[PDB]
Amino acid sequence: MVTPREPKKRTTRKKKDPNAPKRALSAYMFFANENRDIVRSENPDITFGQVGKKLGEKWKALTPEEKQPYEAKAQADKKRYESEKELYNATLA
């Protein structure tokens, strides 16, 4: 029932287009994307209800000296995602 208004069962020519954001990621998403596999690999039986909590407790307790690069990476990816999106909205105006 998503949007009762359906323009002739979707009548678009070119839906997918270049220069498009890919959703940035936070320092937690990076350390969680990798750690989520380390735990899921050592224990695929447990779901994200424990895997994500494992990366959250490890990262949260992860010395700031090691997180330095992590958060910094999220900032570099935060500008890349916000940069591409800004260009799109600025190109369509």
From Swiss-Prot:
Basic residues bias located where? 7-16
Example GO biological process? chromatin remodeling
Where does this protein bind DNA? Answer: 21-89
**Region span, Disordered:** 1-23, 69-93
> Which keywords label this protein?
Chromosome, DNA damage, DNA repair, DNA-binding, Nucleus, Transcription, Transcription regulation
Q: Where in the cell is it found?
A: Nucleus; Chromosome
Chief location of this protein?
nucleus
Describe the effect of residue 31 to D: Shows a strongly reduced affinity for linear and circular DNA
State the GO CC annotations.
Answer: chromosome; nucleus; protein-DNA complex
Under InterPro entries, the record lists: HMG_box_dom (IPR009071), HMG_box_dom_sf (IPR036910), HMGB (IPR050342)
- Read off the CDD domains from this record: HMG-box_NHP6-like
Functional summary from the UniProt entry: DNA-binding protein that induces severe bending of DNA. Required for DNA-binding by the FACT complex, a general chromatin factor that acts to reorganize nucleosomes. The FACT complex is involved in multiple processes that require DNA as a template such as mRNA elongation, DNA replication and DNA repair. Also augments the fidelity of transcription by RNA polymerase III independently of any role in the FACT complex. Required for transcriptional initiation fidelity of some but not all tRNA genes. Seems to be functionally redundant with NHP6B.
- Indicate the family of this protein: Belongs to the NHP6 family.
Q: What else is known?
A: Present with 3870 molecules/cell in log phase SD medium.
| The protein's assembly and partners | Weakly associates with the stable SPT16-POB3 heterodimer to form the FACT (yFACT or SNP) complex, which is associated with nucleosomes. Multiple molecules of NHP6 (NHP6A and/or NHP6B) are required to recruit the SPT16-POB3 heterodimer to DNA.
Its name, as the record gives it, is Non-histone chromosomal protein 6A
The record lists the organism as Saccharomyces cerevisiae (strain ATCC 204508 / S288c) (Baker's yeast)
